[PDB]
Amino acid sequence: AGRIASFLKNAWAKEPVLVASFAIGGLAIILPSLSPYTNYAIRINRATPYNYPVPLRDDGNMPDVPSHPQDPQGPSLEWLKNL
Amino acid sequence: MWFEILPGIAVMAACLFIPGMATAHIHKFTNGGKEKRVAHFSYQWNLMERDRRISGVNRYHVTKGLENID
């Protein structure tokens, strides 16, 4: 509080570039873990359809699988359209 | 001045206009006037090959619309 403050003031007086570099690096390390949007980024990455979705063979007891793309079942990207 | 530098800068600008404008004009001329197709990935190249095959003239830019469904 009284020693590190003086050291930081001296470093800012002498080596502003190093102070800026270390500040930016520390922020880049810390903030991603403290952000609510990282999960949204992972979800957006997961939502991109790079390859064909192969349909599953109906056995008769798959209520959570849709029969048509426009059926109410299946994942929804309405969270993305308003993001 | 000081405005006597302007003729040289204008000649520079006239010379630098030619590359991009001529490239755009040649792309339109060679591909039928519609902005030569970009194939960054293999899917787009396959689309171009299919268009070339179904064009009946071996040019990919010749497009066949609804008038091929009889």
Binding site: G25, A28, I29, P32, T38, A41, I42, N45, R46, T48 | -
Partner: protein, 115 residues
């Protein structure tokens, strides 16, 4: 095919330019004219003699750091993975090691040239 044609045309233009440069003007070569230049007086030694380089250590460091950039080159593509946390952790770890190498060589007086 188009890139090879472009390279061939560029090289051909440069070669035609140098041929025009060497075959158009009148040339009258003699021993005094072609002698090596050194402010009028004849040079003492020769160009071939060893030339001390005071930044050899920085050159080796550049060799090692050049490799690090290659590792960092594929980062834009790697940002599209579903394991964003792992990719971010590894990218930050690699950059932190690069910065630590730079700091270690700085503090050990490795960035200062030889006298």
């Amino acid at each position: 095919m188009n890139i090879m044609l472009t390279l061939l045309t560029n090289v051909t233009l440069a070669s035609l330019l140098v041929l025009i440069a060497f075959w158009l003007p009148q040339l009258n070569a003699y021993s005094e004219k072609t002698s090596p230049y050194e402010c009028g007086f004849d040079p003492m030694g020769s160009a071939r003699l060893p030339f001390s380089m005071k930044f050899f250590l920085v050159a080796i460091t550049f060799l090692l750091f050049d490799l690090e950039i290659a590792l960092l080159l594929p980062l834009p593509w790697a940002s599209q993975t579903n394991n964003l946390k792992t990719m971010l952790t590894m990218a930050l770890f690699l950059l932190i090691l690069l910065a630590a190498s730079l700091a270690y060589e700085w503090t050990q007086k490795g960035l200062e040239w030889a006298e």
